[PDB]
Amino acid sequence: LSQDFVEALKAVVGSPHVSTASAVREQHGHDESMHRCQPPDAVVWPQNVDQVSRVASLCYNQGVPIIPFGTGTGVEGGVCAVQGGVCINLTHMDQITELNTEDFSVVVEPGVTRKALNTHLRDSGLWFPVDPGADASLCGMAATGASGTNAVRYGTMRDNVINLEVVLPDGRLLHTAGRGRHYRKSAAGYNLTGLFVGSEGTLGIITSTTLRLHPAPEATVAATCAFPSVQAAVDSTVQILQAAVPVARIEFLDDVMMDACNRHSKLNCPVAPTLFLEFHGSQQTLAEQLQRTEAITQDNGGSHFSWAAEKRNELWAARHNAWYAALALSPGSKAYSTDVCVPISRLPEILVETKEEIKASKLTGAIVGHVGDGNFACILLVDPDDAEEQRRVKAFAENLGRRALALGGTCTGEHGIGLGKRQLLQEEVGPVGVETMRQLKNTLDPRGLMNPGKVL
Ligand SMILES: Cc1cc2nc3c(=O)[nH]c(=O)nc-3n(C[C@H](O)[C@H](O)[C@H](O)COP(=O)(O)OP(=O)(O)OC[C@H]3O[C@@H](n4cnc5c(N)ncnc54)[C@H](O)[C@@H]3O)c2cc1C
């Protein structure tokens, strides 16, 4: 990367906001997955959207790849600089604006996390529900198409992103639904917002997100329920969904995951395949939901509910840190994770099969999942130096992905494709799907400089 180019970057954002130091680049060359670190040639911190536009235009016209970087909590290698280039860390733009409580909407910049937003909203009676375990950038969550434990009731990022401000690869500024606009529904033209949700930094740089807010629930009850088998826990889940109980949260942990979370968070749940549950409503509707849900879990051998502000907060903090609980089983390890999502009636087959396949192998694996969406993760601990085991883990993940595709599902419910699932995506949507996706990529990023090597 030439000295003249570095000076041009510094002229846009300021000398302190450009770094070519090896240690700084290495810290921005990896995320939380096992994908090996590939450092960008420079890291740049733009201070406003005009600077984002000017950095993008500079890189684009000089043939330098651009890698958007939020909080670096992704798990598919999205920020790995496989072709070098400039990593654009967006988190100094951290303002909340256009809070419209009467319309249930707010605008956030990339440095705003879910925790920051919900702190800003206390005593408003509103909250933002999409809750990945990590303290991630909300714009990064829009870029990956994230979901969370609350999505079963309150929707994913795709359901809750109303508008996006995007710097396109050559620097033009796009407001996907129109500048300043916010509304419940529209048929006006093609829905551009949905195209950029889940684009993972390959179509442009999200510099603000307009988010749907939700009313805080009148009352909340959380509980855990232990089961004799994975089959019994997942059968209960499917039957709760088929009975249309509007559960707020329904999370599955297998016995390995439950033990790991016990050791990592000082929960003391019985070591068993377990559902973490949460219900929202008035006392009238809560009693009803609890009736019907306990009836179904009882039929499948579930325990009497172990009830859980502080202990509920402990419970979900433990769930949100399950990834790190899994890592603590094998200290010094990184992990890869599957993330399939299947038609819910096929969820029992594939989780029970996954549990059986994990035991039939020497692999360490923990299972946790948004099973209310028909989605789950197998978190696979890897020694960073054991090449044999690492290709056993990638082969396991590949096979599980193809099993989900055989059942009519998808290879990723929320984490994305990044570097790891590109072959699975080709199988998932076929040749005409791949070409159509590539044609959209090419019109927005003709030079292929927008996070190259990812997704397609
Ligand atoms: C403990 C743990 C728990 C998690 N739980 C969940 C979960 O329940 N659900 C879930 O969906 N994910 C989960 N994740 C994954 C991760 O938190 C999400 O994918 C999150 O959306 C990533 O945001 P980020 O800013 O940290 O991404 P980064 O790693 O910074 O970036 C991810 C990708 O998005 C791109 N990108 C980032 N910001 C922008 C932007 N502003 N504009 C354009 N492209 C951008 C990057 O180029 C990259 O390709 C978890 C991760 C961890 C470590």
Short mmCIF file of C-alpha atoms and ligand atoms in Angstrom, two decimals:
data_model
loop_
_atom_site.label_atom_id
_atom_site.label_comp_id
_atom_site.label_asym_id
_atom_site.label_seq_id
_atom_site.Cartn_x
_atom_site.Cartn_y
_atom_site.Cartn_z
CA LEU A 1 0.00 0.00 0.00
CA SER A 2 1.75 3.18 -1.22
CA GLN A 3 2.72 6.13 0.93
CA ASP A 4 0.81 8.50 -1.36
CA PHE A 5 -2.35 6.46 -0.83
CA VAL A 6 -1.91 6.45 2.97
CA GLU A 7 -1.49 10.23 2.96
CA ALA A 8 -4.68 10.55 0.91
CA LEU A 9 -6.55 8.50 3.53
CA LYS A 10 -5.11 10.66 6.32
CA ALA A 11 -6.24 13.76 4.42
CA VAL A 12 -9.85 12.54 4.70
CA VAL A 13 -10.12 11.25 8.27
CA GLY A 14 -7.12 12.74 10.06
CA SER A 15 -3.73 11.24 10.92
CA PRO A 16 -4.83 9.60 14.22
CA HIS A 17 -7.62 7.74 12.39
CA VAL A 18 -5.42 5.82 9.91
CA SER A 19 -3.12 3.00 10.99
CA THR A 20 -0.73 0.76 9.06
CA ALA A 21 0.80 -0.75 12.22
CA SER A 22 0.98 -4.55 12.17
CA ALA A 23 -0.57 -5.06 15.61
CA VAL A 24 -3.53 -2.79 14.79
CA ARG A 25 -4.10 -4.52 11.46
CA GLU A 26 -3.92 -7.98 13.06
CA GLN A 27 -6.60 -7.00 15.60
CA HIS A 28 -8.88 -6.17 12.64
CA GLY A 29 -8.04 -9.23 10.54
CA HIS A 30 -10.20 -11.77 12.35
CA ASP A 31 -13.51 -12.09 14.13
CA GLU A 32 -14.69 -14.56 16.78
CA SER A 33 -14.51 -17.62 14.50
CA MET A 34 -11.63 -20.01 13.78
CA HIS A 35 -11.06 -18.45 10.34
CA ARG A 36 -7.40 -17.60 10.26
CA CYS A 37 -6.46 -13.98 10.69
CA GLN A 38 -5.80 -12.12 7.43
CA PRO A 39 -4.76 -8.57 8.29
CA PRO A 40 -5.86 -5.64 6.16
CA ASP A 41 -3.17 -3.34 4.82
CA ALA A 42 -4.58 -0.42 6.83
CA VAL A 43 -7.36 0.39 9.29
CA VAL A 44 -9.31 3.65 8.93
CA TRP A 45 -11.85 5.20 11.34
CA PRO A 46 -14.12 7.67 9.52
CA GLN A 47 -15.72 10.27 11.77
CA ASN A 48 -18.84 11.06 9.69
CA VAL A 49 -20.67 9.85 6.59
CA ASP A 50 -18.95 12.37 4.30
CA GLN A 51 -15.66 10.78 5.35
CA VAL A 52 -17.01 7.25 4.75
CA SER A 53 -17.99 8.33 1.25
CA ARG A 54 -14.59 9.88 0.53
CA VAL A 55 -12.65 6.88 1.87
CA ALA A 56 -14.79 4.51 -0.21
CA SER A 57 -14.31 6.60 -3.35
CA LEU A 58 -10.55 6.74 -2.79
CA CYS A 59 -10.23 2.97 -2.33
CA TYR A 60 -12.63 2.09 -5.12
CA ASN A 61 -10.95 4.23 -7.77
CA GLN A 62 -7.48 3.02 -6.78
CA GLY A 63 -8.45 -0.67 -6.91
CA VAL A 64 -8.04 -1.19 -3.15
CA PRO A 65 -10.47 -3.58 -1.40
CA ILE A 66 -12.76 -2.25 1.32
CA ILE A 67 -13.68 -4.34 4.39
CA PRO A 68 -16.42 -2.85 6.61
CA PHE A 69 -15.77 -3.55 10.28
CA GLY A 70 -18.27 -3.17 13.10
CA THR A 71 -17.55 -4.80 16.45
CA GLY A 72 -15.76 -7.85 14.96
CA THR A 73 -18.08 -10.37 16.66
CA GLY A 74 -19.08 -12.20 13.46
CA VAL A 75 -18.42 -15.92 13.23
CA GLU A 76 -17.90 -16.56 9.50
CA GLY A 77 -14.76 -14.59 8.72
CA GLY A 78 -16.61 -11.62 7.28
CA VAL A 79 -13.87 -9.17 8.30
CA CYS A 80 -10.90 -11.32 7.19
CA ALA A 81 -8.95 -9.33 4.57
CA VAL A 82 -8.40 -12.18 2.15
CA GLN A 83 -7.21 -9.76 -0.58
CA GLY A 84 -5.71 -7.16 1.77
CA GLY A 85 -7.03 -3.65 1.47
CA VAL A 86 -8.48 -1.05 3.82
CA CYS A 87 -10.52 -2.08 6.87
CA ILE A 88 -13.04 0.67 7.65
CA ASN A 89 -13.86 0.59 11.36
CA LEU A 90 -17.20 2.39 11.66
CA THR A 91 -17.62 2.55 15.43
CA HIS A 92 -16.62 6.18 16.04
CA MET A 93 -19.96 7.16 14.48
CA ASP A 94 -21.94 6.29 17.59
CA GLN A 95 -24.94 8.65 17.77
CA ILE A 96 -28.62 7.84 18.27
CA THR A 97 -30.92 10.22 16.39
CA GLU A 98 -34.51 10.70 15.27
CA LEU A 99 -35.97 8.89 18.26
CA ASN A 100 -39.68 8.85 17.42
CA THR A 101 -41.34 7.15 20.38
CA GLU A 102 -44.85 7.87 19.06
CA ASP A 103 -43.99 6.06 15.80
CA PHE A 104 -41.93 3.26 17.42
CA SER A 105 -38.74 4.10 15.49
CA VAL A 106 -35.15 5.30 15.96
CA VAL A 107 -32.03 5.88 13.83
CA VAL A 108 -28.63 4.55 14.96
CA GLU A 109 -25.06 4.87 13.70
CA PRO A 110 -22.65 1.88 13.56
CA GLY A 111 -21.01 2.48 16.94
CA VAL A 112 -24.36 2.04 18.75
CA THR A 113 -24.80 -1.40 20.31
CA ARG A 114 -28.07 -2.95 21.44
CA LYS A 115 -27.08 -2.31 25.06
CA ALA A 116 -26.42 1.38 24.35
CA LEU A 117 -29.77 1.75 22.57
CA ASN A 118 -31.79 0.03 25.29
CA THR A 119 -30.01 2.10 27.95
CA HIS A 120 -30.97 5.22 26.00
CA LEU A 121 -34.56 3.98 25.98
CA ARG A 122 -35.09 3.23 29.64
CA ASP A 123 -38.22 4.90 31.05
CA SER A 124 -39.46 5.34 27.46
CA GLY A 125 -41.54 2.18 27.70
CA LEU A 126 -39.93 0.97 24.45
CA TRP A 127 -37.10 -1.47 23.73
CA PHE A 128 -35.26 -2.99 20.80
CA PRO A 129 -35.66 -6.80 20.90
CA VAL A 130 -33.19 -8.42 18.49
CA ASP A 131 -30.55 -9.86 20.84
CA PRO A 132 -27.48 -11.72 19.58
CA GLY A 133 -25.38 -12.86 22.50
CA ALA A 134 -22.56 -10.47 21.62
CA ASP A 135 -22.56 -6.72 22.30
CA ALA A 136 -22.59 -6.10 18.57
CA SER A 137 -22.96 -3.04 16.35
CA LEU A 138 -26.61 -2.66 15.35
CA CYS A 139 -25.53 -1.74 11.82
CA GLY A 140 -23.34 -4.86 11.78
CA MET A 141 -26.43 -6.82 12.85
CA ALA A 142 -28.29 -5.33 9.88
CA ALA A 143 -25.38 -6.27 7.62
CA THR A 144 -25.39 -9.92 8.76
CA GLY A 145 -29.18 -10.33 8.95
CA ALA A 146 -28.89 -11.22 12.65
CA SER A 147 -31.54 -12.67 14.92
CA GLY A 148 -31.61 -13.54 18.61
CA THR A 149 -33.55 -15.25 21.37
CA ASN A 150 -36.41 -12.72 21.11
CA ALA A 151 -36.87 -13.17 17.35
CA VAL A 152 -39.40 -16.01 17.70
CA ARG A 153 -41.90 -13.38 18.94
CA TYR A 154 -40.49 -9.99 17.92
CA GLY A 155 -38.78 -10.74 14.59
CA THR A 156 -35.27 -10.80 13.13
CA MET A 157 -33.27 -7.83 11.86
CA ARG A 158 -35.04 -8.28 8.51
CA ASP A 159 -38.37 -7.76 10.29
CA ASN A 160 -37.18 -4.77 12.31
CA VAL A 161 -35.04 -2.75 9.86
CA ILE A 162 -37.24 -0.01 8.34
CA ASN A 163 -34.59 1.95 6.41
CA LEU A 164 -30.82 1.94 5.82
CA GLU A 165 -28.30 4.63 4.96
CA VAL A 166 -25.67 3.00 2.73
CA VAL A 167 -22.46 4.31 1.22
CA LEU A 168 -22.20 2.40 -2.05
CA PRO A 169 -18.77 1.08 -3.10
CA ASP A 170 -17.93 4.13 -5.27
CA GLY A 171 -19.01 6.54 -2.49
CA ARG A 172 -22.57 7.47 -3.51
CA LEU A 173 -25.01 7.80 -0.60
CA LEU A 174 -28.21 5.72 -0.75
CA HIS A 175 -31.16 5.85 1.63
CA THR A 176 -32.75 2.53 0.81
CA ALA A 177 -36.34 3.60 1.58
CA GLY A 178 -35.74 7.33 1.06
CA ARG A 179 -34.03 9.92 3.27
CA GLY A 180 -35.74 10.32 6.62
CA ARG A 181 -38.57 7.93 5.83
CA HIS A 182 -40.14 5.53 8.30
CA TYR A 183 -43.42 3.67 7.98
CA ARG A 184 -45.07 0.30 8.61
CA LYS A 185 -45.38 -0.92 5.01
CA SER A 186 -44.74 0.15 1.43
CA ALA A 187 -45.24 -1.11 -2.12
CA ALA A 188 -43.26 1.80 -3.60
CA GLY A 189 -40.84 0.41 -6.16
CA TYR A 190 -38.48 -2.41 -5.32
CA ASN A 191 -37.70 -3.00 -1.65
CA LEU A 192 -34.06 -1.98 -1.50
CA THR A 193 -33.86 -2.21 2.30
CA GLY A 194 -34.22 -5.98 2.28
CA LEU A 195 -31.46 -6.35 -0.29
CA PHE A 196 -28.90 -4.71 1.99
CA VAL A 197 -29.98 -6.54 5.15
CA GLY A 198 -27.83 -9.64 5.17
CA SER A 199 -25.40 -8.37 2.53
CA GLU A 200 -22.40 -8.73 4.93
CA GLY A 201 -20.52 -5.70 3.61
CA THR A 202 -20.38 -6.95 0.01
CA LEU A 203 -22.84 -4.39 -1.44
CA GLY A 204 -21.97 -1.22 0.47
CA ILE A 205 -21.31 0.27 3.90
CA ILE A 206 -24.25 0.73 6.28
CA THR A 207 -23.77 4.08 8.02
CA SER A 208 -27.14 4.26 9.75
CA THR A 209 -30.06 1.94 10.43
CA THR A 210 -33.68 2.90 11.10
CA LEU A 211 -35.07 0.39 13.59
CA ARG A 212 -38.53 -0.65 14.71
CA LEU A 213 -39.01 -0.33 18.47
CA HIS A 214 -41.47 -2.38 20.54
CA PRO A 215 -43.51 -1.70 23.69
CA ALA A 216 -42.06 -3.21 26.83
CA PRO A 217 -44.10 -6.21 28.01
CA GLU A 218 -46.59 -5.65 30.82
CA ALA A 219 -45.20 -8.60 32.78
CA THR A 220 -42.44 -11.17 32.23
CA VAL A 221 -41.88 -14.73 33.48
CA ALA A 222 -38.79 -16.80 32.70
CA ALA A 223 -38.12 -20.44 33.48
CA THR A 224 -35.99 -23.45 32.65
CA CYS A 225 -37.26 -26.96 31.96
CA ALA A 226 -35.11 -30.10 31.96
CA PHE A 227 -35.85 -33.07 29.72
CA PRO A 228 -34.82 -36.75 29.64
CA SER A 229 -33.65 -36.57 26.02
CA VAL A 230 -33.00 -34.27 23.09
CA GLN A 231 -35.99 -35.87 21.36
CA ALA A 232 -38.29 -34.90 24.24
CA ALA A 233 -37.08 -31.29 24.36
CA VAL A 234 -37.35 -30.71 20.61
CA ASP A 235 -40.71 -32.49 20.33
CA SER A 236 -41.97 -30.13 23.04
CA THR A 237 -40.68 -27.16 21.06
CA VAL A 238 -42.41 -28.23 17.86
CA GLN A 239 -45.65 -28.85 19.72
CA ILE A 240 -45.50 -25.47 21.49
CA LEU A 241 -45.14 -23.77 18.11
CA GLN A 242 -47.88 -25.86 16.52
CA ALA A 243 -50.20 -24.94 19.42
CA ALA A 244 -49.48 -21.26 18.59
CA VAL A 245 -48.36 -20.30 22.11
CA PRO A 246 -46.83 -16.80 21.61
CA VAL A 247 -43.72 -17.61 23.66
CA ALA A 248 -41.29 -14.69 23.88
CA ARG A 249 -38.12 -16.82 24.06
CA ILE A 250 -37.58 -20.56 23.60
CA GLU A 251 -33.93 -21.63 23.60
CA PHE A 252 -32.51 -25.14 23.55
CA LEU A 253 -29.29 -26.31 25.24
CA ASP A 254 -28.12 -29.88 25.09
CA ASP A 255 -26.56 -31.45 28.17
CA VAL A 256 -23.03 -30.57 27.01
CA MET A 257 -24.00 -26.92 26.56
CA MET A 258 -25.91 -26.83 29.85
CA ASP A 259 -22.87 -28.17 31.74
CA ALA A 260 -20.60 -25.67 29.97
CA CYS A 261 -22.88 -22.75 30.88
CA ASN A 262 -23.06 -24.02 34.47
CA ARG A 263 -19.27 -23.92 34.70
CA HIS A 264 -18.91 -20.56 32.95
CA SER A 265 -21.72 -18.56 34.59
CA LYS A 266 -22.37 -20.26 37.96
CA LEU A 267 -25.82 -21.31 36.99
CA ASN A 268 -26.62 -24.62 38.68
CA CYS A 269 -29.20 -26.08 36.33
CA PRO A 270 -29.59 -29.86 36.19
CA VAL A 271 -27.27 -31.18 33.49
CA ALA A 272 -29.80 -32.28 30.87
CA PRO A 273 -31.21 -31.15 27.53
CA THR A 274 -32.98 -27.99 28.62
CA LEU A 275 -35.33 -25.29 27.37
CA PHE A 276 -34.91 -21.72 28.56
CA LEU A 277 -38.34 -20.08 28.24
CA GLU A 278 -39.76 -16.60 28.61
CA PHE A 279 -43.36 -15.40 28.45
CA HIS A 280 -44.73 -11.87 28.00
CA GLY A 281 -48.19 -10.55 28.76
CA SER A 282 -50.58 -9.51 31.48
CA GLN A 283 -51.16 -11.78 34.47
CA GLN A 284 -54.26 -13.09 32.69
CA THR A 285 -52.49 -14.03 29.46
CA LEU A 286 -49.33 -15.26 31.24
CA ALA A 287 -51.34 -17.76 33.30
CA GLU A 288 -52.91 -19.02 30.08
CA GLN A 289 -49.65 -19.41 28.16
CA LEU A 290 -48.06 -21.13 31.15
CA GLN A 291 -50.97 -23.60 31.40
CA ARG A 292 -50.72 -24.71 27.81
CA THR A 293 -46.92 -24.77 27.68
CA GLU A 294 -46.53 -26.77 30.90
CA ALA A 295 -49.14 -29.21 29.60
CA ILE A 296 -47.05 -29.84 26.48
CA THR A 297 -43.70 -30.06 28.25
CA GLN A 298 -45.19 -32.45 30.85
CA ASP A 299 -46.40 -34.78 28.08
CA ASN A 300 -42.78 -35.04 26.90
CA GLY A 301 -41.22 -35.63 30.32
CA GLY A 302 -40.24 -32.05 31.06
CA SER A 303 -39.59 -31.03 34.64
CA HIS A 304 -41.76 -28.65 36.58
CA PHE A 305 -40.65 -25.18 35.53
CA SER A 306 -37.73 -23.78 37.52
CA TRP A 307 -38.77 -20.16 37.77
CA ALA A 308 -36.59 -17.07 37.50
CA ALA A 309 -35.10 -9.24 37.85
CA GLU A 310 -31.65 -10.37 38.83
CA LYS A 311 -32.04 -14.12 38.34
CA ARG A 312 -33.78 -13.69 34.99
CA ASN A 313 -30.87 -11.43 34.01
CA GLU A 314 -28.43 -14.17 35.10
CA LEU A 315 -30.27 -16.78 33.06
CA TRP A 316 -30.17 -14.88 29.79
CA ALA A 317 -26.64 -13.59 30.39
CA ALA A 318 -25.56 -17.23 30.63
CA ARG A 319 -27.36 -18.02 27.37
CA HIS A 320 -25.85 -14.98 25.66
CA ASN A 321 -22.37 -16.17 26.67
CA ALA A 322 -22.87 -19.80 25.56
CA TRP A 323 -20.29 -19.33 22.80
CA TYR A 324 -17.62 -18.49 25.38
CA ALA A 325 -18.87 -21.23 27.71
CA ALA A 326 -18.25 -23.71 24.88
CA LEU A 327 -14.77 -22.25 24.30
CA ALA A 328 -13.90 -22.64 27.99
CA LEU A 329 -14.28 -26.42 27.67
CA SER A 330 -11.00 -26.47 25.71
CA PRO A 331 -8.92 -23.49 26.87
CA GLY A 332 -6.95 -21.78 24.15
CA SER A 333 -9.45 -22.93 21.52
CA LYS A 334 -11.27 -21.13 18.76
CA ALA A 335 -14.54 -22.44 17.39
CA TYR A 336 -16.51 -22.98 14.22
CA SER A 337 -20.30 -23.15 14.33
CA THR A 338 -23.10 -24.51 12.19
CA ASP A 339 -26.30 -22.51 12.05
CA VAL A 340 -28.87 -24.45 9.98
CA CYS A 341 -32.57 -23.63 9.92
CA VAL A 342 -35.10 -26.27 8.80
CA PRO A 343 -38.89 -26.57 8.50
CA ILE A 344 -39.95 -26.97 12.11
CA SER A 345 -41.48 -30.42 11.66
CA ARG A 346 -38.03 -31.69 10.58
CA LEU A 347 -36.22 -30.12 13.54
CA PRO A 348 -36.49 -33.25 15.76
CA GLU A 349 -34.91 -35.44 13.09
CA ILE A 350 -31.93 -33.19 12.47
CA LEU A 351 -31.12 -32.28 16.10
CA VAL A 352 -31.39 -35.89 17.23
CA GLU A 353 -29.20 -36.91 14.27
CA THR A 354 -26.71 -34.14 15.10
CA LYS A 355 -26.44 -35.30 18.70
CA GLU A 356 -25.88 -38.88 17.53
CA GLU A 357 -23.25 -37.75 15.01
CA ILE A 358 -21.42 -35.66 17.63
CA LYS A 359 -21.14 -38.69 19.89
CA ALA A 360 -20.02 -40.99 17.12
CA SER A 361 -17.02 -38.70 16.52
CA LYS A 362 -14.04 -37.61 18.62
CA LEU A 363 -15.23 -34.03 18.18
CA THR A 364 -16.21 -31.84 21.10
CA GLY A 365 -19.51 -30.20 20.28
CA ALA A 366 -22.10 -28.20 22.18
CA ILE A 367 -25.63 -27.58 20.88
CA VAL A 368 -27.57 -24.37 21.54
CA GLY A 369 -30.29 -22.84 19.46
CA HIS A 370 -33.16 -20.55 18.55
CA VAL A 371 -35.30 -23.65 18.11
CA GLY A 372 -38.48 -21.55 18.06
CA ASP A 373 -37.33 -20.57 14.55
CA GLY A 374 -36.34 -24.12 13.62
CA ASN A 375 -32.72 -22.98 14.03
CA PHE A 376 -29.78 -24.25 16.07
CA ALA A 377 -26.01 -23.99 16.35
CA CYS A 378 -23.45 -26.76 16.83
CA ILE A 379 -20.42 -25.05 18.38
CA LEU A 380 -17.29 -27.05 17.55
CA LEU A 381 -14.17 -26.39 19.59
CA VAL A 382 -10.91 -26.49 17.61
CA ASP A 383 -7.26 -26.59 18.60
CA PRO A 384 -5.78 -23.81 16.41
CA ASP A 385 -2.73 -26.03 15.69
CA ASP A 386 -4.43 -29.43 15.07
CA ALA A 387 -4.94 -29.42 11.31
CA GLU A 388 -6.34 -32.97 11.34
CA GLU A 389 -9.12 -32.16 13.81
CA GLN A 390 -9.86 -28.83 12.14
CA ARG A 391 -10.66 -30.55 8.85
CA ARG A 392 -12.76 -33.08 10.75
CA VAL A 393 -14.70 -30.12 12.17
CA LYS A 394 -15.14 -28.44 8.81
CA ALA A 395 -16.21 -31.76 7.26
CA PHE A 396 -18.74 -32.28 10.07
CA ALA A 397 -20.15 -28.78 9.56
CA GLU A 398 -20.33 -29.28 5.79
CA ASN A 399 -22.23 -32.56 6.21
CA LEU A 400 -24.68 -31.03 8.68
CA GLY A 401 -25.30 -28.15 6.29
CA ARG A 402 -26.05 -30.54 3.45
CA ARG A 403 -28.40 -32.54 5.68
CA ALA A 404 -30.37 -29.36 6.38
CA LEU A 405 -30.49 -28.58 2.66
CA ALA A 406 -31.80 -32.09 2.00
CA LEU A 407 -34.68 -31.33 4.42
CA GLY A 408 -35.72 -28.18 2.54
CA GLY A 409 -33.95 -25.78 4.91
CA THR A 410 -31.12 -23.27 4.77
CA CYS A 411 -27.46 -23.53 5.66
CA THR A 412 -27.59 -20.42 7.85
CA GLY A 413 -30.44 -18.99 9.87
CA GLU A 414 -28.65 -15.86 11.11
CA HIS A 415 -24.81 -15.97 11.15
CA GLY A 416 -24.34 -15.58 7.39
CA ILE A 417 -22.05 -17.08 4.77
CA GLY A 418 -18.77 -15.17 4.99
CA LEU A 419 -15.88 -17.45 4.06
CA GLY A 420 -17.23 -20.70 5.42
CA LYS A 421 -20.55 -21.48 3.73
CA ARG A 422 -19.98 -20.33 0.13
CA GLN A 423 -20.20 -23.83 -1.33
CA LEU A 424 -23.35 -24.58 0.68
CA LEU A 425 -24.95 -21.38 -0.65
CA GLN A 426 -24.30 -22.52 -4.23
CA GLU A 427 -26.09 -25.80 -3.50
CA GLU A 428 -28.89 -24.00 -1.65
CA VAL A 429 -30.02 -21.62 -4.40
CA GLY A 430 -28.66 -23.35 -7.50
CA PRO A 431 -27.13 -21.92 -10.66
CA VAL A 432 -29.84 -19.38 -11.45
CA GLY A 433 -29.91 -18.18 -7.85
CA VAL A 434 -26.12 -17.81 -7.77
CA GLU A 435 -26.01 -15.93 -11.07
CA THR A 436 -28.84 -13.59 -10.01
CA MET A 437 -27.09 -12.85 -6.71
CA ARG A 438 -23.84 -12.21 -8.60
CA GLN A 439 -25.55 -9.86 -11.06
CA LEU A 440 -26.82 -7.77 -8.14
CA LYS A 441 -23.32 -7.75 -6.62
CA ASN A 442 -21.84 -6.67 -9.95
CA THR A 443 -24.13 -3.71 -10.54
CA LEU A 444 -23.47 -2.27 -7.09
CA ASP A 445 -19.75 -3.23 -6.95
CA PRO A 446 -18.51 -3.50 -10.55
CA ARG A 447 -14.84 -3.70 -9.56
CA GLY A 448 -15.42 -6.42 -6.95
CA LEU A 449 -13.69 -4.39 -4.23
CA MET A 450 -16.49 -4.47 -1.63
CA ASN A 451 -15.35 -7.15 0.84
CA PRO A 452 -14.01 -9.56 -1.80
CA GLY A 453 -14.08 -13.30 -1.32
CA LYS A 454 -17.20 -13.36 0.88
CA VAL A 455 -20.69 -14.83 0.30
CA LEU A 456 -20.30 -15.42 -3.44
C1 LIG B 1 -20.99 -14.85 21.85
C2 LIG B 1 -21.63 -14.56 20.52
C3 LIG B 1 -23.00 -14.74 20.36
C4 LIG B 1 -23.62 -14.48 19.14
N1 LIG B 1 -24.99 -14.67 19.03
C5 LIG B 1 -25.56 -14.41 17.87
C6 LIG B 1 -26.98 -14.61 17.76
O1 LIG B 1 -27.73 -15.05 18.64
N2 LIG B 1 -27.49 -14.29 16.51
C7 LIG B 1 -26.77 -13.82 15.43
O2 LIG B 1 -27.39 -13.55 14.38
N3 LIG B 1 -25.43 -13.64 15.55
C8 LIG B 1 -24.86 -13.92 16.72
N4 LIG B 1 -23.50 -13.72 16.85
C9 LIG B 1 -22.72 -13.28 15.66
C10 LIG B 1 -22.48 -11.78 15.58
O3 LIG B 1 -22.60 -11.16 16.85
C11 LIG B 1 -23.50 -11.16 14.61
O4 LIG B 1 -23.29 -11.76 13.34
C12 LIG B 1 -23.38 -9.64 14.52
O5 LIG B 1 -24.45 -9.18 13.70
C13 LIG B 1 -22.05 -9.20 13.94
O6 LIG B 1 -21.92 -7.77 14.08
P1 LIG B 1 -20.50 -7.12 14.12
O7 LIG B 1 -20.57 -5.60 13.94
O8 LIG B 1 -19.74 -7.56 15.35
O9 LIG B 1 -19.84 -7.79 12.84
P2 LIG B 1 -18.39 -7.82 12.19
O10 LIG B 1 -17.71 -9.09 12.56
O11 LIG B 1 -17.71 -6.54 12.46
O12 LIG B 1 -18.83 -7.88 10.70
C14 LIG B 1 -19.64 -8.97 10.20
C15 LIG B 1 -19.83 -8.83 8.72
O13 LIG B 1 -20.68 -7.69 8.44
C16 LIG B 1 -19.94 -6.71 7.73
N5 LIG B 1 -20.27 -5.41 8.31
C17 LIG B 1 -20.13 -5.01 9.62
N6 LIG B 1 -20.55 -3.79 9.85
C18 LIG B 1 -21.01 -3.36 8.62
C19 LIG B 1 -21.59 -2.15 8.19
N7 LIG B 1 -21.82 -1.11 9.00
N8 LIG B 1 -21.92 -2.05 6.88
C20 LIG B 1 -21.71 -3.09 6.08
N9 LIG B 1 -21.17 -4.27 6.37
C21 LIG B 1 -20.85 -4.35 7.66
C22 LIG B 1 -18.47 -7.10 7.81
O14 LIG B 1 -17.78 -6.62 6.65
C23 LIG B 1 -18.57 -8.62 7.89
O15 LIG B 1 -18.70 -9.22 6.61
C24 LIG B 1 -22.85 -14.01 18.07
C25 LIG B 1 -21.48 -13.81 18.22
C26 LIG B 1 -20.86 -14.09 19.44
C27 LIG B 1 -19.37 -13.88 19.57
#
